[PDB]
Each structure stands twice: as C-alpha cells, then as structure tokens.
Amino acid sequence: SQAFQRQLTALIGYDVTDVSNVHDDELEFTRRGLVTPRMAEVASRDPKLYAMHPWVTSKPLPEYLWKKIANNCIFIVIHRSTTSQTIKVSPDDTPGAILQSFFTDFVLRVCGRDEYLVGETPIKNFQWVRHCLKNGEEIHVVLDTPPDPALDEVRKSLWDCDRKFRVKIRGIDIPVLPRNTDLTVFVEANIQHGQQVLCQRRTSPKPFTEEVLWNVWLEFSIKIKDLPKGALLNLQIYCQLLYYVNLLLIDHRFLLRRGEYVLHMWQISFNADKLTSATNPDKENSMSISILLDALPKEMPNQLRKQLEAIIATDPLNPLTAEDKELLWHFRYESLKHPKAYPKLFSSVKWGQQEIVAKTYQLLARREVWDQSALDVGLTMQLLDCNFSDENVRAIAVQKLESLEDDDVLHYLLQLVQAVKFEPYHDSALARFLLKRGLRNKRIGHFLFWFLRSEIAQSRHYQQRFAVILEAYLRGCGTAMLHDFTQQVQVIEMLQKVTLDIKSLYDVSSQVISQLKQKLENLQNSQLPESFRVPYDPGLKAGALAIEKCKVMASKKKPLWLEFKCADPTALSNETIGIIFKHGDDLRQDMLILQILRIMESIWETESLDLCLLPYGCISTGDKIGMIEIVKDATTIAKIQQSTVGNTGAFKDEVLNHWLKEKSPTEEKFQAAVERFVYSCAGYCVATFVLGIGDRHNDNIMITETGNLFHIDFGHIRVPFVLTPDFLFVMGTSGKKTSPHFQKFQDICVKAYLALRHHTNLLIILFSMMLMTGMPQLTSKEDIEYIRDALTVGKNEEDAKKYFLDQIEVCRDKGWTVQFNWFLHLVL
Ligand SMILES: CC(C)n1ncnc1-c1cc2c(s1)-c1ccc(C(N)=O)cc1OCC2
Numbered sequence: 001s002q003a004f005q006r007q008l009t010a011l012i013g014y015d016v017t018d019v020s021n022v023h024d025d026e027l028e029f030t031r032r033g034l035v036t037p038r039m040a041e042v043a044s045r046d047p048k049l050y051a052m053h054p055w056v057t058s059k060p061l062p063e064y065l066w067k068k069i070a071n072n073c074i075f076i077v078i079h080r081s082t083t084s085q086t087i088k089v090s091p092d093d094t095p096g097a098i099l100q101s102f103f104t105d106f107v108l109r110v111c112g113r114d115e116y117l118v119g120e121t122p123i124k125n126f127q128w129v130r131h132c133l134k135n136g137e138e139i140h141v142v143l144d145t146p147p148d149p150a151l152d153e154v155r156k157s158l159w160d161c162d163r164k165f166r167v168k169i170r171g172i173d174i175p176v177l178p179r180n181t182d183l184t185v186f187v188e189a190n191i192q193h194g195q196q197v198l199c200q201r202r203t204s205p206k207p208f209t210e211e212v213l214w215n216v217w218l219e220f221s222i223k224i225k226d227l228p229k230g231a232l233l234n235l236q237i238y239c240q241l242l243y244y245v246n247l248l249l250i251d252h253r254f255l256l257r258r259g260e261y262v263l264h265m266w267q268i269s270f271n272a273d274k275l276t277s278a279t280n281p282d283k284e285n286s287m288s289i290s291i292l293l294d295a296l297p298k299e300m301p302n303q304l305r306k307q308l309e310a311i312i313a314t315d316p317l318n319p320l321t322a323e324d325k326e327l328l329w330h331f332r333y334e335s336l337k338h339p340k341a342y343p344k345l346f347s348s349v350k351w352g353q354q355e356i357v358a359k360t361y362q363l364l365a366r367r368e369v370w371d372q373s374a375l376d377v378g379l380t381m382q383l384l385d386c387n388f389s390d391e392n393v394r395a396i397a398v399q400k401l402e403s404l405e406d407d408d409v410l411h412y413l414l415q416l417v418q419a420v421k422f423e424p425y426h427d428s429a430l431a432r433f434l435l436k437r438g439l440r441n442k443r444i445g446h447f448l449f450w451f452l453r454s455e456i457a458q459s460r461h462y463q464q465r466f467a468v469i470l471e472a473y474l475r476g477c478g479t480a481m482l483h484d485f486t487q488q489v490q491v492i493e494m495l496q497k498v499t500l501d502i503k504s505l506y507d508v509s510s511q512v513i514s515q516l517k518q519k520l521e522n523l524q525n526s527q528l529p530e531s532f533r534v535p536y537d538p539g540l541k542a543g544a545l546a547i548e549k550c551k552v553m554a555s556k557k558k559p560l561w562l563e564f565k566c567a568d569p570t571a572l573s574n575e576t577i578g579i580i581f582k583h584g585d586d587l588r589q590d591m592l593i594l595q596i597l598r599i600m601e602s603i604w605e606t607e608s609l610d611l612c613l614l615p616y617g618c619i620s621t622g623d624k625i626g627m628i629e630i631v632k633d634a635t636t637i638a639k640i641q642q643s644t645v646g647n648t649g650a651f652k653d654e655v656l657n658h659w660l661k662e663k664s665p666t667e668e669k670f671q672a673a674v675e676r677f678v679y680s681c682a683g684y685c686v687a688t689f690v691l692g693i694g695d696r697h698n699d700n701i702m703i704t705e706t707g708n709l710f711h712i713d714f715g716h717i718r719v720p721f722v723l724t725p726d727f728l729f730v731m732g733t734s735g736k737k738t739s740p741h742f743q744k745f746q747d748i749c750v751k752a753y754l755a756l757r758h759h760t761n762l763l764i765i766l767f768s769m770m771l772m773t774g775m776p777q778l779t780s781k782e783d784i785e786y787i788r789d790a791l792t793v794g795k796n797e798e799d800a801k802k803y804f805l806d807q808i809e810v811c812r813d814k815g816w817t818v819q820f821n822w823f824l825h826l827v828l
Pocket of ligand 1: 555559580582590616628629630631632633634635712713714715
C-alpha cells in the first residue's frame with residue numbers, strides 16, 4: 001500500500017501525506033472525514049451502470065430536433081464484425097425494446113467511442129443520439145459484450161466568555177526586502193465573515209525593514225461569544241496593500257484558536273485567493289507574521305410589502321442599504337416565503353452577534369417553502385459565493401443541488417469546483433457533494449479529476465484543499481479509471497516537455513520541423529503509452545501518433561499541432577484525432593469562457609432556440625500549459641482575408657462568400673453553410689457582448705468548411721462585438737441595405753438576447769464567480785458591474801431589443817475601422 005500512495009501523488013501533483021505547510025490537522029481531519037462519504041458512494045452505485053456510464057438527459061427533445069425526425073422513425077445501423085443492418089426505431093423505444101426488435105448478454109456500444117446505450121430511458125433521451133440529429137449524422141453502433149463490473153474494483157464554552165477578542169502582534173519578518181528605499185509599514189488585523197469586516201484594528205506605522213517588532217495587544221470591539229463559525233482573522237500589511245494571511249478563529253473541531261502562530265504571507269479587491277486558510281509554502285522567501293492567542297456549542301402594510309418586494313426583485317449585484325437590510329430582517333418570516341429573497345435576507349444578518357445567528361438558525365429550521373420550491377441554479381449558486389461564510393446557509397444550497405441530474409452537474413461542474421474556494425473549511429457540504437457525484441458517474445469523475453488537477457498545478461492558495469478532495473476521489477473511482485488517468489498523465493507530462501523545449505529553439509524553420517518529428521519518434525518508440533483517453537472527450541480513445549501530420553504552429557507561443565490515430569478499431573471514419581499543446585497563456589480562462597458558452601447553449605435549449613455555437617475541448621493541465629481540440633476543416637477569418645490581400649490590411653467584403661462557394665461542392669451545401677453562418681454568427685455576437693469579450697481581432701475568430709463560425713483564444717481577455725462588412729456580404733447586405741438573411745439574423749440575435757435575459761441572475765452569478773476564481777487581473781466592483789448594463793437589468797423587452805439593435809448598427813457604422821486598428825497593433 002506504500003507504492004499506492006506514491007501512485008496517487010503522481011496522479012495529483014501534490015503529496016497529501018506531507019505536513020510541511022500546516023499549523024493544524026485540518027487537511028488530515030478532512031482526509032479522514034472524507035473516508036465516510038467515499039465508501040458511502042462506492043458501496044451504493046450500480047456496478048454495471050457505473051462501468052457503462054449511460055450519458056442520458058431527462059430534458060425534453062427541443063422543437064428544432066423534432067423537425068429532423070420523419071414518421072417517428074430513427075434509423076440506427078447495428079454492426080456484427082463485417083455485416084450491418086439498419087433498423088426502424090421509435091423515439092420512445094428503450095435500448096432493450098430495440099434489442100428484442102433486432103433478434104425478431106449483449107450491449108449496444110458506439111463505433112470508435114467508449115460510449116454505451118443502456119438504461120431504462122428512451123432512445124431520444126441519450127446525449128449521443130441528440131448529437132447525431134443536430135449534426136445530421138447517422139447512428140452507428142457495434143453489438144458486443146458489456147464490460148466486467150469487476151474491472152472497477154476499489155482497493156480495500158465559547159458562550160460563557162464575555163471578553164472582547166484580542167490578538168498580540170509580535171512582529172513581521174522578511175529575508176530580503178524589495179529595492180524600493182524607503183517606505184513605512186503597519187499590520188491591519190480584520191475579523192471577516194463572508195467578505196464582511198466585523199471589526200478592524202491597525203498598528204503604528206514603523207519603517208519597512210527585514211525585521212519589524214510591535215508586541216502590541218490589539219483588542220477588538222467584538223466579544224468572544226459573538227464570534228461565528230467560519231470567521232477569519234485576516235492579517236494584512238500596508239505601505240498600498242502588499243502582504244496578506246488568514247487564520248480561522250474557530251477550528252474544524254468547533255474550538256476557539258489558542259497558541260503561538262508563525263504564518264507565511266502571500267504577496268500582491270474581489271479575488272478568491274485573498275480568502276485562503278492556507279499559508280505561503282515558500283518559507284525562505286515569503287514575509288512571516290508572529291501572533292499570540294489565549295469550544296463553540298451548536299400582517300404587513302401595503303407600502304412596506306411593496307418595498308420588500310422591490311428589494312427581492314432587484315439583481316444579485318444591486319447593493320443593500322441599512323434600511324433594506326433592517327426591513328428584510330424585521331420581516332424575515334415574510335422574506336422566508338420568497339425563495340429569491342434568501343441571498344439578500346442572509347446578507348442582512350448581523351453575523352457578529354450570537355443572538356441574531358441563533359435566530360437565523362431558528363429561521364433556517366422553518367424550511368418548508370425552500371424544500372418544496374423548484375431548484376433555481378442561479379439562486380443556489382448565489383448562496384455559495386464569497387458573501388456566504390455560514391455552513392447552515394451554504395448547506396441549504398448544497399441541499400438544492402442534490403436534485404440536479406448528472407447531465408446538469410456536468411454543465412456547472414467547473415463553477416461548483418471553483419466555488420470550493422469560497423468555503424471557510426476544507427471539509428464542506430459542497431466538497432462532499434462533488435465527491436459523491438464524481439464517484440456516481442464516470443464522466444463527472446473524469447472531468448472532476450482534470451478540474452481539480454488544473455488548480456493543484458497552478459494555484460498554491462488552494463492546492464492543499466483540492467489535493468485532499470482529489471485523493472478522496474481517486475481512492476474510490478476504481479483501478480480501471482486509476483490506470484486511465486495514469487496513462488493520460490504520462491502522455492501529458494511527456495508532451496508538455498517537448499512544447500517548452502521546442503519553444504526555446506518567428507518563422508518555423510526546417511531544423512525545428514525535423515527536431516519535433518525526431519523528438520516524437522523517440523517518444524513513440526517504447527516510451528509513450530499505446531492508448532489513452534482524450535481529456536476533453538472521455539469517449540474518444542487516442543492511440544499511435546501521425547508524425548507526418550505533426551507540426552509547430554505559426555504563433556508567437558510556438559504551439560504543437562498533434563494528430564493521433566484512433567485506438568478503437570471499430571471506428572467508422574479513419575480521421576485522426578487532433579490536439580494542440582500550448583504554453584504562455586492561462587488556459588483556465590479559456591476553460592471558463594467555453595463552459596459558459598455550453599451553459600448559454602443549454603439556456604437557449606430551454607427556450608427551444610439553436611444558436612450554432614462551437615465550444616471545442618480545452619483542458620488546463622499545468623502552469624500556463626494545457627490542451628485544445630482541433631476542429632476539423634476550419635480556418636481563421638484573417639487567414640481568408642490574407643489569401644487575396646496578404647501583407648496589407650485592405651479587407652475586401654466579397655472574400656468570405658467566395659471562400660464558402662469554393663469549399664462547398666453543391667449549391668444546396670453553400671446555402672446550408674450560409675444558414676449555419678447566420679445562426680453561428682448570431683449566437684457568438686450575443687454571447688461575446690454579454691461576457692464583454694466582443695472587441696476581438698479576426699485572427700482569434702474562425703469558420704468551418706460547413707459554415708460554422710466560432711471564436712477562439714480567450715486567454716488574452718471600440719465595438720460591442722464583431723460584425724464586419726465581409727460577414728454582412730454573406731447575408732447579402734452592403735452599407736445601408738436589407739436582406740432576407742439579415743432580417744433573419746436580427747430576429748435570431750434579439751430572440752437569443754432576450755432568452756439569456758430570462759436567466760439574468762444565473763449569468764450575473766456565473767460571471768461574478770468567474771472574475772474572482774479565474775481572473776486574477778479583473779477583481780474590481782466596476783469589472784463585475786459591466787454584465788448588468790450588457791443584459792439591460794430592470795428594462796422592458798422592447799427597450800432591450802432596441803438597445804442590442806443599436807449595438808448591431810455601431811458595428812455597421814464602424815465597418816472595418818476596428819479590424820484596421822487591430823492590424824496596426826497585433827500584426828504591426
Ligand atoms: C493560439 C491558439 C493556439 N489557441 N489558443 C487558444 N485557443 C487556440 C486555438 C483554438 C482552436 C484552434 S487554435 C484551431 C486552429 C486551427 C485549426 C485548423 N483546422 O486548422 C483548428 C483549430 O481548432 C479549433 C480551436
């Protein structure tokens with residue numbers, strides 16, 4: 001079992017057994033505490049269904065997907081070695097009903113993929129079947145024996161103390177101070193509880209040197225009994241803010257913090273990193289702080305109702321005044337009747353007062369309206385952010401998450417994993433929920449692994465917490481997945497080495513081309529594993545490389561264009577699997593944007609609208625390094641303009657429509673490509689403006705030979721969005737004109753915009769969370785408050801329609817002005 005821990009450490013990228021960077025047993029208690037829910041999920045899941053992981057959705061089949069089916073008949077081609085027979089199938093027919101219709105144990109598995117069609121669910125309720133219908137692809141399956149479930153085998157009093165809390169600041173120690181000579185420094189100790197300061201105490205500004213002592217006893221205005229569970233002693237250093245460290249006043253065992261503490265401090269408003277209980281690991285270079293500390297038990301009038309209702313109606317970013325807070329609390333039993341009032345009501349609570357917390361806990365016990373109400377993701381996500389530090393408030397949100405089908409868990413997984421950063425303690429209801437859903441489904445578990453792993457590799461603030469959560473997962477997923485992750489980690493480690501070695505060696509010379517091909521030759525010849533699962537697509541199995549097709553892309557960060565043969569021999573097409581390995585940009589920023597685009601698609605699915613978005617695979621694997629999916633038969637918009645006019649930016653309107661006519665053979669395929677372009681442009685115009693990533697150079701915008709348009713490279717981040725005259729010519733418009741396709745485009749854009757406006761609260765919370773956990777540069781109140789204006793908060797459907805149509809005209813009025821200005825900066 002000693003070699004097993006060594007295996008886990010290699011799969012995590014962090015040692016959970018290491019106690020070099022702790023001042024308490026929280027992580028070890030969490031490791032022990034997670035054993036119970038781990039073994040509780042392993043010994044409760046269906047062993048057969050877990051091995052086959054049926055990717056199913058209980059959501060209704062949309063209006064656009066029903067029109068594709070003929071006489072309630074879906075053709076599915078079943079394969080037997082060489083022979084194949086197409087069968088007429090009803091959408092309501094279960095996989096078992098189709099099997100009895102074939103012969104008149106064996107399971108139906110997709111050709112080329114490790115995706116199975118099992119379970120008591122209709123054929124139309126499968127995610128692969130819905131994908132085939134959307135792309136107009138034919139359903140091909142191979143009849144083979146189900147996988148052995150034996151392969152997934154798993155290895156066997158505080159309220160008695162009226163004293164006003166005090167902290168002794170002994171002093172600060174830094175080995176080497178920066179060259180800036182000379183400034184003054186003071187210690188700012190704050191008692192926080194969900195980004196809310198309960199009390200603040202500063203020190204006398206002494207000069208900044210390698211050693212600064214104080215011995216100062218800082219007494220706070222808050223009593224020891226009034227300190228809540230999850231409150232943080234935030235120790236800061238100002239000149240302005242340079243060093244920070246946090247300490248949980250109440251431990252994981254409900255005890256008040258007592259003793260001597262030497263904490264190593266992080267260097268430099270809404271950032272998730274400023275909340276961490278973890279100290280800086282680099283003890284030989286980081287600023288230190290010495291402190292001294294010397295068990296917690298478990299009818300309204302008309303005008304006022306209108307006031308309370310107007311408060312509940314406001315957006316999540318709308319600030320609450322003292323009057324608003326006092327009203328929500330006085331009428332807390334009326335506020336409990338409205339589930340949308342819960343975030344605002346729980347922000348109105350005076351957490352620094354015991355009696356109020358007790359009354360809040362009494363209020364939370366009266367949960368009946370909350371338990372019965374329909375799950376609102378945006379509302380549930382609101383209670384899991386930086387503004388909520390109470391485990392009872394946070395648990396009622398985790399309670400509502402339990403009703404999410406494995407389909408929707410995948411939609412919000414990244415953001416739920418990022419929400420763990422807002423948890424005061426390592427062991428939390430949300431951490432246990434992710435673990436439970438990760439062991440219940442192989443797909444969620446695979447994605448959870450990479451989501452946690454991406455954070456362990458490039459975040460010292462949260463690497464310890466996530467390493468415990470991952471170790472807990474890896475100790476219950478099974479040896480089948482354990483070996484798969486081993487093969488995936490091995491290939492990634494080997495390929496990342498080559499990416500940086502090649503980058504060290506503007507133009508792509510013949511020397512570097514042969515060097516990469518030689519490096520890949522040495523790796524394929526007895527070193528690289530024969531087969532590995534694609535991190536961005538668990539179904540797809542990659543095998544041997546295609547060294548001939550392998551190259552180094554003509555980009556400033558020298559990315560590796562890699563092509564692999566499909567390891568699955570039952571594969572239909574002989575098309576290679578394409579992966580891009582890149583270093584230099586934060587791919588976590590691309591992971592977040594792309595997952596939001598997948599959320600935006602599912603939002604449009606509820607309104608039965610299909611905006612042809614292309615949220616390609618992108619997984620962050622390490623520090624500034626990760627992988628991308630190669631979208632087959634696609635080119636850059638700038639590259640299409642470079643065919644006619646290369647070196648210069650004399651952009652011609654006709655080029656795009658000529659490129660589509662060239663790549664599409666039949667005239668019907670051209671109209672189908674223009675039809676795909678009409679929807680894809682519409683979706684990407686709305687999605688980009690809402691997120692405020694509209695202003696882009698056409699080098700970062702792509703199109704497929706099938707007509708599908710898509711934005712790329714979000715690692716970087718005037719016009720509201722990108723609507724150029726060349727895009728408008730495909731529609732059939734030039735200058736001040738109209739077209740049957742432009743009239744269509746304007747109608748779909750407005751349909752898409754107002755469809756997202758129904759899920760305003762969801763988008764606002766997902767965006768607010770994105771800027772805190774994934775954007776270390778965009779951490780201001782004004783940065784988050786952009787989404788409100790973009791989505792037109794508190795506006796009529798007519799005004800909002802008119803607002804977006806004006807943004808369309810701004811792009812028409814500018815035309816090429818923005819792209820031409822982009823050409824004078826990025827290119828030259
Ligand atoms: C600058 C590149 C490496 N980058 N940084 C973030 N995302 C990307 C890319 C995404 C995609 C790219 S590059 C792409 C480029 C060319 C082809 C192609 N077919 O030539 C296919 C591609 O995959 C789709 C997304």
